[PDB]
Scaffold this active site. Sequence first.
Site, short mmCIF file in Angstrom:
data_model
loop_
_atom_site.label_atom_id
_atom_site.label_comp_id
_atom_site.label_asym_id
_atom_site.label_seq_id
_atom_site.Cartn_x
_atom_site.Cartn_y
_atom_site.Cartn_z
N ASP A 211 -17.92 -85.15 -56.37
CA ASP A 211 -17.85 -86.48 -55.70
C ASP A 211 -17.76 -86.33 -54.17
O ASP A 211 -17.15 -87.20 -53.52
CB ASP A 211 -16.72 -87.30 -56.31
CG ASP A 211 -17.06 -87.74 -57.72
OD1 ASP A 211 -18.20 -87.45 -58.19
OD2 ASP A 211 -16.22 -88.37 -58.34
N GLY B 14 -13.27 -93.31 -64.73
CA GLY B 14 -12.72 -93.09 -63.39
C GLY B 14 -13.03 -94.26 -62.48
O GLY B 14 -13.24 -95.37 -63.01
N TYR C 1 -22.58 -80.91 -66.10
CA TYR C 1 -21.50 -81.12 -67.09
C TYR C 1 -20.43 -80.04 -66.94
O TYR C 1 -20.78 -78.85 -66.98
CB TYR C 1 -22.08 -81.12 -68.50
CG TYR C 1 -21.05 -81.21 -69.58
CD1 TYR C 1 -20.15 -82.26 -69.63
CD2 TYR C 1 -20.99 -80.25 -70.58
CE1 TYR C 1 -19.19 -82.33 -70.63
CE2 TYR C 1 -20.04 -80.30 -71.58
CZ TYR C 1 -19.13 -81.34 -71.59
OH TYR C 1 -18.22 -81.37 -72.60
N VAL D 191 -17.17 -95.55 -66.74
CA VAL D 191 -17.15 -94.60 -67.89
C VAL D 191 -18.02 -93.40 -67.53
O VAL D 191 -19.05 -93.60 -66.85
CB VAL D 191 -17.61 -95.28 -69.19
CG1 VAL D 191 -17.52 -94.34 -70.39
CG2 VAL D 191 -16.83 -96.56 -69.46
N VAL D 192 -17.61 -92.21 -67.96
CA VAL D 192 -18.42 -90.96 -67.90
C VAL D 192 -18.67 -90.50 -69.34
O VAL D 192 -17.72 -90.48 -70.13
CB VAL D 192 -17.74 -89.87 -67.04
CG1 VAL D 192 -18.58 -88.61 -66.98
CG2 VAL D 192 -17.44 -90.39 -65.64
N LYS E 271 -22.59 -90.80 -65.45
CA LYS E 271 -21.61 -91.76 -64.86
C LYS E 271 -22.25 -93.14 -64.84
O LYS E 271 -23.26 -93.31 -64.15
CB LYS E 271 -21.19 -91.31 -63.46
CG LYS E 271 -20.79 -89.85 -63.36
CD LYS E 271 -20.70 -89.34 -61.93
CE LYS E 271 -19.94 -88.03 -61.82
NZ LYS E 271 -19.61 -87.72 -60.41
N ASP F 259 -12.55 -86.90 -49.38
CA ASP F 259 -11.51 -87.22 -50.40
C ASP F 259 -11.24 -85.98 -51.26
O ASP F 259 -11.18 -86.10 -52.51
CB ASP F 259 -11.92 -88.45 -51.22
CG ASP F 259 -10.80 -89.03 -52.08
OD1 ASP F 259 -9.61 -88.71 -51.82
OD2 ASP F 259 -11.12 -89.76 -53.01
N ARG G 124 -7.90 -84.11 -58.16
CA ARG G 124 -8.49 -85.17 -59.02
C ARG G 124 -10.02 -85.19 -58.84
O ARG G 124 -10.70 -85.79 -59.72
CB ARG G 124 -7.88 -86.54 -58.73
CG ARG G 124 -8.15 -87.09 -57.34
CD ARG G 124 -7.65 -88.51 -57.09
NE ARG G 124 -7.80 -88.75 -55.66
CZ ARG G 124 -6.97 -88.31 -54.73
NH1 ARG G 124 -5.88 -87.65 -55.05
NH2 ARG G 124 -7.23 -88.53 -53.46
N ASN G 125 -10.55 -84.63 -57.75
CA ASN G 125 -12.02 -84.58 -57.47
C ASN G 125 -12.57 -83.17 -57.65
O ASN G 125 -13.65 -82.89 -57.11
CB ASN G 125 -12.31 -85.10 -56.07
CG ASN G 125 -12.15 -86.61 -56.00
OD1 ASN G 125 -12.35 -87.30 -57.00
ND2 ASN G 125 -11.82 -87.12 -54.83
C1 LIG Z 1 -9.50 -86.16 -62.85
C2 LIG Z 1 -10.70 -86.93 -62.91
C3 LIG Z 1 -10.88 -87.91 -64.00
O1 LIG Z 1 -9.93 -88.62 -64.27
N1 LIG Z 1 -12.02 -88.05 -64.72
C4 LIG Z 1 -12.19 -89.04 -65.82
C5 LIG Z 1 -13.71 -89.28 -65.92
C6 LIG Z 1 -14.24 -87.83 -65.66
O2 LIG Z 1 -14.06 -87.05 -66.85
C7 LIG Z 1 -14.80 -85.96 -67.10
N2 LIG Z 1 -15.85 -85.69 -66.36
C8 LIG Z 1 -16.62 -84.62 -66.61
C9 LIG Z 1 -17.73 -84.40 -65.68
N3 LIG Z 1 -18.56 -83.40 -65.75
N4 LIG Z 1 -19.43 -83.53 -64.66
C10 LIG Z 1 -19.07 -84.63 -63.96
O3 LIG Z 1 -19.60 -85.02 -62.95
N5 LIG Z 1 -18.03 -85.19 -64.58
C11 LIG Z 1 -16.38 -83.74 -67.67
C12 LIG Z 1 -15.28 -84.01 -68.50
C13 LIG Z 1 -14.95 -83.19 -69.61
C14 LIG Z 1 -13.84 -83.51 -70.37
C15 LIG Z 1 -13.04 -84.62 -70.06
C16 LIG Z 1 -13.33 -85.45 -69.01
C17 LIG Z 1 -14.46 -85.15 -68.21
C18 LIG Z 1 -13.28 -87.29 -64.56
#
Ligand SMILES: *CCC(=O)N1CC[C@H](Oc2nc(-c3n[nH]c(=O)[nH]3)cc3ccccc23)C1
Length: 270
Positions: free
Chosen positions: A151, A23, A88, A27-28, A42, A133, A137-138
Site C-alpha cells: 500500500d 481493510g 498474494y 474486502v480482500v 481488493k 503510511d 499494519r501495511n
Molecule cells: C493488517 C492488515 C489487514 O488488516 N488486512 C485485512 C485485509 C488484508 O488481508 C490479507 N491480505 C492479503 C494480501 N495479499 N496481498 C495483498 O495485497 N493483500 C493476504 C492475506 C492472507 C491472509 C489473511 C489476510 C490477508 C490485510
Amino acid sequence: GLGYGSWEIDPKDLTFLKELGTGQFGVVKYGKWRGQYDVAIKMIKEGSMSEDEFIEEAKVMMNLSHEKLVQLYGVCTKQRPIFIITEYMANGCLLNYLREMRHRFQTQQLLEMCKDVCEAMEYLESKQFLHRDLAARNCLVNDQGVVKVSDFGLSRYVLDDEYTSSVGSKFPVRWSPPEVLMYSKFSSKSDIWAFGVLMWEIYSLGKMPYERFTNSETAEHIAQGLRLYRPHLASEKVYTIMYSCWHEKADERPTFKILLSNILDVMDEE
Ligand SMILES: *CCC(=O)N1CC[C@H](Oc2nc(-c3n[nH]c(=O)[nH]3)cc3ccccc23)C1
C-alpha cells in the site's frame, strides 16, 4: 486485449476462491488469474478512494518492482467497484503475524523482518517515492515468512478526512515525527521516523506504540522530545538503530541506505 491498457486487468480472467479480510477500502479476496496465478483482489468500496487519481498513479506503481515490495499486477477499471490486483501474501498482515505467540520468534527472525522492510524502503527512496503510511499494519508476510511492504503511497487517495489530516481521528499519529504533527512536513525523513516505529513494533511482537497514551498524549510526548524505549527483545545495537530514526532534527536521521548497512552490521555481529 483490445479494450485494455498495460495497467488494466480483465476481471473475467479472475477466479474468486476465499475471503481474506476487510481493510480501509473494503474486502480482500484470494483468487487465480487465468486459472493458474495466485492473486489478492481488493474490492474498493464506492466513495472510499479518489479513483481517477489512483488509476493515473497505478501506472507509476506498476513500474515499482522489488522483491520486498508487494507487486501491483493491475486494476479492474471498467466497473463498480474497481478491483486492485496484487501479489498474494498467504501469511497476511505483519501485525497479526507478530501477535501470534505460537511462532516463538528468534531475534534473528525479527532482524530479518526489519531488513526485508529496509530493502523495500531503500528501493522506494532510490525512486524518490514516499510510502507516507509505513507501519506493521501495511506490511504482509508470504508463505516463506518473507515480509514485504504493501500500500505504498495509497494514503494519498483516501477520501475519509478522519484518516488524512494530522488531528483526524484515524491519522497515524503514533508513526509520525514532530514536523508532521506540528505542520504536515512530509519527507523521506518522515518515512525514516515511521520505519523506526515499525522496528519497535517488530521487536515488541506487535504491541501498540505508546500503548498507555491517547493520540493527543503521544503528540505532546514526542513534541517535548520524549520517545519510545527499548523493547526487551532488542539488543543495545538494534535499539541504537531504531532510536537513530527519531532525531528531533529530520536532517540528522539516517537514510534507508545507512539503516540497511547498520542492520547488515548487526546481523553479522549478533
Ligand atoms: C493488517 C492488515 C489487514 O488488516 N488486512 C485485512 C485485509 C488484508 O488481508 C490479507 N491480505 C492479503 C494480501 N495479499 N496481498 C495483498 O495485497 N493483500 C493476504 C492475506 C492472507 C491472509 C489473511 C489476510 C490477508 C490485510
